[PDB]
Amino acid sequence: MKTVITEVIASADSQGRFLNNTELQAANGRFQRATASMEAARALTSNADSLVKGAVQEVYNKFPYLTQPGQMGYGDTNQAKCARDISHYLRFITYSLVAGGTGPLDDYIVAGLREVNRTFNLSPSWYIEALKHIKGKVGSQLSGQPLTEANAYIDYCINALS
């Protein structure tokens, strides 16, 4: 899993060399940031649910036809799934904030994203809206660096999805 700390270790390990000042400087960077990151995670974790409801909802407004019978958005099972999925995205994001790297995101969400989505005919677009809607809400509960961090990670996914 890719976090700042793991990477410098890895790099040191490959070369076969002790951790020297170079790497520690980097580490120092992380952990300094953490304070903001951690704050952001506390905020998302708390409002989770509400964010999720709002998102799922949004998607339907954005793509009305999904809720029509014979579509994907239709019938509770699917709605349940839709909820579940977004929860996941969120969950991971928090993780990544705390871990201080994209690592968690990469391994759970991103790797294999395309093919899964292809085989089950999940349209990236949807997810994206979810995220965007989220981003917008988060853009109230947070501020300054905490906010900035939250965004970064949220986006990271947008880009991976698109």
Partner 1 sequence: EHFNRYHKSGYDAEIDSYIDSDEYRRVFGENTVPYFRGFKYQVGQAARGFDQMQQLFAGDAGSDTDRGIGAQPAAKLTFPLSRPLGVT
Partner 2 sequence: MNVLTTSSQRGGKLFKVTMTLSPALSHHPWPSLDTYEPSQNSYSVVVPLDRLLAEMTYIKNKGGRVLDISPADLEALGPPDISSVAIPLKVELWAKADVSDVQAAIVAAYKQIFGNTYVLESERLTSAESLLRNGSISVREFVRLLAKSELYKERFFFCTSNNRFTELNFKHFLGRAPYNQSEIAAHLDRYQTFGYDAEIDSYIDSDEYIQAFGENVVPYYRGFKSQSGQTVESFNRMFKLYRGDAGSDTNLNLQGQKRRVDPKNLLRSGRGI
Partner 3 sequence: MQDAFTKAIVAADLRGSFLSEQELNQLTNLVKESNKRLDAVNAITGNAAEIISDAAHKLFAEQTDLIRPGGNAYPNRRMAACLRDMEIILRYVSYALLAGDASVLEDRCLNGLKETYVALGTPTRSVARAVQLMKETAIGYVNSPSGVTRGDCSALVNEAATYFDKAAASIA
Q: Which residues are annotated as a binding site for (2R,3E)-phycocyanobilin?
A: 60, 81-82, 84-85
- Number of residues lying near its own copies (CB under 8 A): 36
| Cβ neighbours, 10 Å, residue 116 | 11
Q: Nearest Cα to 90, choosing from 39, 130, 122, 58?
A: 130
List the one residue from 14, 32, 77, 140 that touches partner 1 (CB under 8 A).
14
15 sits near partner 1 (criterion: CB under 8 A): yes
94 sits near its own copies (criterion: CB under 8 A): no
**Minimum separation from the CB atom of position 40 to ligand CYC (A):** 12
**Residue 111: what are its φ and ψ, rounded to 5°?**
-60, 120
Q: How far apart are CA 123 and CA 41, in angstroms?
A: 28
Tokens matching residue 84: 């579940």
**Minimum separation from the CB atom of position 9 to partner 2 (A):** 9
* Among 42-50, 70-78, 96-104, 135-143, the segment contacting ligand CYC (CB under 6 A): 70-78
35 sits near partner 3 (criterion: CB under 8 A): yes
Residue 76 burial (C-beta neighbours within 10 Å; 0-12, 13-18, 19+): exposed
